[PDB]
Amino acid sequence: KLLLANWGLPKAVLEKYHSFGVKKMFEWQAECLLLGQVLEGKNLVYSAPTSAGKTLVAELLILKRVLEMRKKALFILPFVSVAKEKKYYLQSLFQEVGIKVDGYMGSTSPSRHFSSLDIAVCTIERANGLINRLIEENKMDLLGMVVVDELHMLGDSHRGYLLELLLTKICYITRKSASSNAVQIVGMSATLPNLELVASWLNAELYHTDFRPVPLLESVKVGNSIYDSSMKLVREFEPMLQVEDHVVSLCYETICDNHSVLLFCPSKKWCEKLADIIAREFYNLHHQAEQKELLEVMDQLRRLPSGLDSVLQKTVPWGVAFHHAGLTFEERDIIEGAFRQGLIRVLAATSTLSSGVNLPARRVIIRTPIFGGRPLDILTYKQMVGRAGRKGVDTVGESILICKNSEKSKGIALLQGSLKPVRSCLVTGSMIRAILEIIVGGVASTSQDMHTYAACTFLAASMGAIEACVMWLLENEFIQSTEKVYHPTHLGSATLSSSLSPADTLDIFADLQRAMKGFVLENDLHILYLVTPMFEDWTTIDWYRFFCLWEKLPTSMKRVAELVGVEEGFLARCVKGKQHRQMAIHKRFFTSLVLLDLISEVPLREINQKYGCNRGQIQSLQQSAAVYAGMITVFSNRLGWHNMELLLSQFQKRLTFGIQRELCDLVRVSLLNAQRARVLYASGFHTVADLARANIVEVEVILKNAVPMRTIWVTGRKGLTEREAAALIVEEARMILQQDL
Amino acid sequence: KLLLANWGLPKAVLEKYHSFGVKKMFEWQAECLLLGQVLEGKNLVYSAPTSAGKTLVAELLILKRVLEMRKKALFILPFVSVAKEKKYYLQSLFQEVGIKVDGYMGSTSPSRHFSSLDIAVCTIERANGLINRLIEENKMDLLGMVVVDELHMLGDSHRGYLLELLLTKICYITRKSASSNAVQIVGMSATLPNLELVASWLNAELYHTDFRPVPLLESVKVGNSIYDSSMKLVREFEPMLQVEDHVVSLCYETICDNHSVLLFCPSKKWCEKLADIIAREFYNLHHQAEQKELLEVMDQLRRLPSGLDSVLQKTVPWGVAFHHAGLTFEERDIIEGAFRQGLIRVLAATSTLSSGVNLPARRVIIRTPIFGGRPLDILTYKQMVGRAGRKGVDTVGESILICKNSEKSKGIALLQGSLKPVRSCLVTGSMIRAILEIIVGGVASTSQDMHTYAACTFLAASMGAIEACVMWLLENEFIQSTEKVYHPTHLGSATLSSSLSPADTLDIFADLQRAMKGFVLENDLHILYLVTPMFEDWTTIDWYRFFCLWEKLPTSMKRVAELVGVEEGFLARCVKGKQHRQMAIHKRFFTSLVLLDLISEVPLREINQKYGCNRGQIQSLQQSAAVYAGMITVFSNRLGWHNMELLLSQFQKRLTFGIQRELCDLVRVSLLNAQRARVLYASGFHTVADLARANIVEVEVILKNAVPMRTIWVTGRKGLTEREAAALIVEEARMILQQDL
Numbered sequence A, B: 001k002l003l004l005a006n007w008g009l010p011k012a013v014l015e016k017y018h019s020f021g022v023k024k025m026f027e028w029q030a031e032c033l034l035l036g037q038v039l040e041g042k043n044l045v046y047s048a049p050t051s052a053g054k055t056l057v058a059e060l061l062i063l064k065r066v067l068e069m070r071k072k073a074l075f076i077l078p079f080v081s082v083a084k085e086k087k088y089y090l091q092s093l094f095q096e097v098g099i100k101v102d103g104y105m106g107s108t109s110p111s112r113h114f115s116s117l118d119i120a121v122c123t124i125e126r127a128n129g130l131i132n133r134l135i136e137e138n139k140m141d142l143l144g145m146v147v148v149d150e151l152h153m154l155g156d157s158h159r160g161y162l163l164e165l166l167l168t169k170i171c172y173i174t175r176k177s178a179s180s181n182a183v184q185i186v187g188m189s190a191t192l193p194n195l196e197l198v199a200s201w202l203n204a205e206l207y208h209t210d211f212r213p214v215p216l217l218e219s220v221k222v223g224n225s226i227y228d229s230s231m232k233l234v235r236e237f238e239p240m241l242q243v244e245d246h247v248v249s250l251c252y253e254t255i256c257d258n259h260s261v262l263l264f265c266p267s268k269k270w271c272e273k274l275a276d277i278i279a280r281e282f283y284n285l286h287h288q289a290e291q292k293e294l295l296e297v298m299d300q301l302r303r304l305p306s307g308l309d310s311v312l313q314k315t316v317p318w319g320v321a322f323h324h325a326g327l328t329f330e331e332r333d334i335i336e337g338a339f340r341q342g343l344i345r346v347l348a349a350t351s352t353l354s355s356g357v358n359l360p361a362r363r364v365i366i367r368t369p370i371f372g373g374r375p376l377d378i379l380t381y382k383q384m385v386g387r388a389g390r391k392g393v394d395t396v397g398e399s400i401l402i403c404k405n406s407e408k409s410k411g412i413a414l415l416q417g418s419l420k421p422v423r424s425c426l427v428t429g430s431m432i433r434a435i436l437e438i439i440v441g442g443v444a445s446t447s448q449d450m451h452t453y454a455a456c457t458f459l460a461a462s463m464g465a466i467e468a469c470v471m472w473l474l475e476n477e478f479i480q481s482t483e484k485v486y487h488p489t490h491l492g493s494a495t496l497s498s499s500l501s502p503a504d505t506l507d508i509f510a511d512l513q514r515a516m517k518g519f520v521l522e523n524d525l526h527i528l529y530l531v532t533p534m535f536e537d538w539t540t541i542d543w544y545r546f547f548c549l550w551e552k553l554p555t556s557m558k559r560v561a562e563l564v565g566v567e568e569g570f571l572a573r574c575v576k577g578k579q580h581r582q583m584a585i586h587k588r589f590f591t592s593l594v595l596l597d598l599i600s601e602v603p604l605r606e607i608n609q610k611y612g613c614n615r616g617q618i619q620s621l622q623q624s625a626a627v628y629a630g631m632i633t634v635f636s637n638r639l640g641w642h643n644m645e646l647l648l649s650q651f652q653k654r655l656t657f658g659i660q661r662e663l664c665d666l667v668r669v670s671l672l673n674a675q676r677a678r679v680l681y682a683s684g685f686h687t688v689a690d691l692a693r694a695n696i697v698e699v700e701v702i703l704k705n706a707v708p709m710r711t712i713w714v715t716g717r718k719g720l721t722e723r724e725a726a727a728l729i730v731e732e733a734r735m736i737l738q739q740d741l
């Protein structure tokens, strides 16, 4: 029975699955897919190692709930990078059968309407908003499927509560129409202890497996000795060519057998240092002093807005490199592709890669059990060591955690530890959000229904607050009480529409209302201070640098600075030689200055030099700001603020792509980010109309010029040759202008 | 030879001309059209009575310069009403042959680009801007024809100088490429003395005729005696049924022969009184106390935003009525159509109708020679008395000017007077505008060329200033001087682009620049104070009323009022119980309040009641404000002001149609002004897409409802039946959404 052809499956999807290598399932997937009425709608909650092909069952169930019972489906993923990778994977897997798959990730939204879509690959943040939209204007009948990758995220997380709110709201909808399902829910999780609780909460069937196609050997390293998980010595490591940790010797031993290695370091500078070191030894140890593919990778990295990196330049032409959050998303994807193809053999990465893309390595060396001054998380450790072993290539996979002295204790604790149980995280902001979501959607009106809703949440399954939440929403004019039936107000409806926390929406309302009274239209800084999310921790602000920039602003910026709350007596002044709101204003002013250079098309390296923030932080900030701009635009649209929504309607795109207004029509093309559109705009093409018939060979020449074979790198298309790149550019322009009218 | 078939002419245009009755030309038209090389391009300047078919030669020459030498053409007309009538006339005459004819009048602009057009029926104000646009971005080769109706307007006028600037600029272009024409110029004028001078100035051939198809008998009336033009008694008038002027007796005598009468009064109240009087007598004198078509006219007047008029209600169902500027444009057109069809037999009109549409009456009675406290203009008198006599119906036409005592002297002076010679009207604002127009267009650079240009104007043909104009443009940063070659600046380029006087553009620049620093986005009043043209004399502002409105403004308006300069200590206060800029601000604030109710879709009668300004003044103000809004939008667009042009980009439409934002897509339909779109919007149609397939019979029912056979009145379509009206509405929506993509 274990064969993808025996199971009912489209021929096109079957032949696409044979391309990636999936031709015979495992026993665990069959036992999970044949777990009673799961194929009919009885929700499903299952756990498996990430290397065991967890998502195959989810994709099969989607194809089912989409083909047989034609309806929409949601694929909720934890992060934007993995969500985009899954969106492109599902697109390449489902294009032939005609299932329109599009993504709601970060700032990007599908050009086509959600009604035209058939699968929405969403982040946790945007899937909740999508379901809120479906509930508001009565379309919950379109949804028939919801898939939640990384179900364990529903516990303690900054975006996990939105996951719970996503399901407890759906289940109520299914359990209020009952006065094998109407909306199926399929969840993928890790080896959680209380998975059952989660399975019973969602009524889903529970499937837990521990099968790993490539066996895993986790071990600790103390001095020169290697011990297994159960405090048993397994090997006496002796360095081959070393100049205790012998990290370089371990990497050398891994490399000698024509394999690759993952090296998880606790910081960025540590990754850059511990990739330089192995590069130096691989030169000296291997030169007594594919290439072509590696030179292609170097040239791909060299035609980027930030260009080549000095440490990358020293490391990459030896098989060694580093992959941390400091690099741009393009550089990170290039390095990840190079490692995936075997071109890069040693990858010094941080913990961020552990939860990100699927990047398996033969040996995973975790330098220290102490990550960022704290012991490594058991979930993080499991995520790292689950990458040890490539399916279908390696016979085994090795994880080596390097510990010492006392550190040995934390290492053995990580070796013998297990995942913590899932939580609920639900007065509190999450419960306020949930109460507002149900009341404003009209799904629940009376307080008896309000407690019934809380009887459907994970808190009720794990085993007052709702009254406090209702009181808070009533006292803050989010909700009105009539003979005590609760009805949404205009502010309460606008909060649920623009997907913002009701806690933040109060100050957002105050800030926008103050901005309407006095606005500065002679720059884009006032329209940016409103769409600037916060400071958070996107960078470590240098006070002197800030004051210097401020001393050199146009004769019109400081007008915007003083109209929003910034000062000069406290503007990188007092803090220069050394208040919770003024700090949040200046740290928002600086943040709004950086975005000012992002929408002014300033090169990332120049922004880094003038502001001191690296390019990864700048890109993260611009993505967050674009999301916030979209939310603020919807908030003003639903409040009847036509003179502000009109101003904000373009800044989401101008921040997503970091462009000027002129390119806002060119960047609609998927392959025109901010530099293949500026060089294509200077040559006279200023509209997607002039680019549909743009001379093919002409745009090839233009893309060949202006360099900061497949040197051009495209997000989701990896590397593209100039000719193929601009051919796809003109084809995308043709499709955009042809299917939008 | 005198036959429209013998002349080379399209068969479709010939059969369309036979519809209006034009089947045999006069001798004067043949002698003017065969005046040497006029048919080849030698410009043409000719004079004829307005009843002699002056424009036939112009239309024939256009068809020529359009069919043979395919190129664009301009039809410059003095006013918006006559320009629109001519646009619809030329459209109905030229649709079959395929000559795309569209109008640049007031605020409306063609949906299609000027390149697609073949005839542009423009006002004098907008034709100059069109020619400036053609000269700027090098398209003067498209223009090959320019037709100027009412050439005598080029002298002393508020829009006449723009006419001269229109031609002296063209001639230079033709006479600078010479270092039978490249742009033909055809002018129609009245019996001017210095026509020759104008003919030689434009190099045009001169044709003057005095032929009138219906002979005219002008006479003066003193007491009971009627004297001819040369102080000779012609008839001893005796009233038939009178209760000296015997105006009513004269109207009765005209009516008894089943004819109609035009009665030109010096004011609006006089027209309303002297139509009520003849209505009263036509009831009492004719009732000892077509109908169906007249009841149709009453119902047409009753389904208007202002509804029926009390004086109109008393007068119209007797054949008598009044036509003054106080009425709406729709009411004026309805009354003019009723008089033209013979339904209305006595029309008490003001001097405004004299220069407007072609409305002939058998007898034209001019009550008094003193019009508005001053003697009647000889041009105005000729314009009035040229309407005496319908071609093809009457055998003669009669003009009767009622004078008395001393007034007799001014009456005989008008009888024996003649038209004053044409002037030039060119430091002065016109010469500044002309110098800026040539320099910024790049057509002239050196001061030698600058004096050469002034050697091409009408001043040079009638027989220092240019140096003063250049100095003024240099000292005001409109123009820069290099090694002394004059180049346009950004402000100088923006002034020529947005078609505003350089005198006004300085204060406009200052006002917009001040508005960018602090703007109020929570209402539309700040975006309206910038697009409010001026006070001029559009109304007589009532101070108490203004202060009352101000005492009752939202909690956000007075914010806009104090941000622009308005006060409360001087805001219908001091002037209430009884400074050239503060007067221009408050009179702009009040004007910006009225427009606020126009874009809020307040009914015209409610605006009239709350502000004290009649509906004709309100409509004139809204048209002027829409023109100003378009000019300001272009001015900000060319100055790189993206945050202001975006705000202003919709107010031109919102003021042209007096609508809200929601209807800005519906009013793109030619038959949806502001009340056939609001009632069609409330039923769910909020987009021109929902109206293309809008159920035909459904929109018929919706238009049948909401009444404030052909009751629906459409501008340019006269009266339309509900079924035909909404059928044309859905057809226009289909065309709009089908040909715009």
Ligand SMILES: COc1ccccc1-c1ccncc1C(=O)Nc1nnc(OCc2ccc(Cl)cc2)s1
Binding pocket: A104, A106, A107, A114, A115, A125, A126, A127, A128, A129, A130, A131, A133, A134, A139, A497, A498, A499, A500, A626, A627, A628, A630, A631, A632, A634
């Ligand atoms: C505020 O909404 C944003 C808009 C722009 C960018 C980011 C956000 C955002 C930010 C932070 N968290 C969440 C969101 C979010 O996506 N909320 C959404 N709500 N509705 C959406 O459209 C989906 C949709 C539309 C129509 C139908 Cl019929 C069905 C589904 S997205």
Ligand SMILES: COc1ccccc1-c1ccncc1C(=O)Nc1nnc(OCc2ccc(Cl)cc2)s1
Binding pocket: B104, B106, B107, B114, B115, B125, B126, B127, B128, B129, B130, B131, B133, B134, B139, B497, B498, B499, B500, B626, B627, B628, B630, B631, B632, B634
């Ligand atoms: C400022 O321009 C306004 C815009 C809106 C409404 C009123 C005005 C206005 C107001 C007062 N006086 C004059 C104008 C005026 O029409 N100026 C114009 N200039 N260019 C135009 O377009 C014609 C055109 C366009 C492209 C080509 Cl290739 C050739 C011709 S219109």
